[PDB]
Design a protein around this ligand. Structure first.
Ligand code: ZN
Length: 228
């Protein structure tokens, strides 16, 4: 069964976050771990996998630990040739090391043919009006929801100032995934109330390694603006 859509009090309010909105912005603004045809090299806890992945660009890490929801997932992927996509953090990361959640898909059989890319449609709703729509791309057949989530938020940060250093133009936001079997789920896009932001804790939602069919999945982003 589907996750029921948000109740009014399910959704975090950015007005109730008095920490730094930049710490959320940072997780999604041109920010991801990406690795291809890798195989885990080690483990810390029972539910995690460590990989030798170096960031090209700014050269900040060469090992990545991904935590999974349970031990069965770790065992399932441990010796598989995988591709990795996700949002990394350094604060309270403990095994040039960085930490993330989920992001795992088997490589073999998971790509479209002629170097093809699959376009996935994101409809954006602002105070319930579909104001803009845009496409994100993946070359994966079964893609993590996290990868599509990161791609969509990166675009909304840049095009819609979704997150800014001090705050956000939006009060609440969730990203909803609609699958072709009718299953739906959603992530809260705002930080928990209070004055600190816990990145390890926020990102932990991706631990389930949730995958969707890229060719068929529908995405909705539902935002509410501040005054009314
Ligand atoms: Zn691959």
């Amino acid at each position: 069964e589907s996750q029921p859509d948000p109740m009014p009090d399910d959704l975090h309010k950015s007005s109730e976050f008095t920490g730094t909105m930049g710490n959320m912005k940072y997780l999604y603004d041109d920010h991801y771990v990406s690795a291809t045809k890798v195989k885990s090299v080690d483990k810390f806890l029972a539910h995690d996998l460590i990989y030798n992945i170096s960031d090209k660009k700014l050269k900040n890490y060469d090992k990545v630990k991904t935590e999974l929801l349970n031990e069965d997932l770790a065992k399932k992927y441990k010796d598989e040739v995988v591709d990795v996509y996700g949002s990394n953090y350094y604060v309270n990361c403990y095994f040039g090391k960085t930490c993330m959640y989920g992001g795992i898909t088997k490589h073999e059989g998971n790509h479209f043919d002629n170097g093809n890319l699959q376009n996935v449609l994101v409809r954006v709703y602002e105070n319930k009006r579909n104001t803009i729509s845009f496409e994100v791309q993946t070359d994966k057949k079964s893609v993590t929801a996290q990868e599509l989530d990161i791609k969509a938020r990166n675009f909304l940060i840049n095009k819609k100032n979704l997150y800014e250093f001090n705050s956000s133009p939006y009060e609440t936001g969730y990203i909803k995934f609609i699958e072709n079997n009718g299953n739906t789920f959603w992530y809260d896009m705002m930080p928990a109330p209070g004055d600190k932001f816990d990145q390890s804790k926020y990102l932990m939602m991706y631990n389930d390694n949730k995958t969707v069919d890229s060719k068929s999945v529908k995405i909705e982003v539902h935002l509410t603006t501040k005054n009314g």
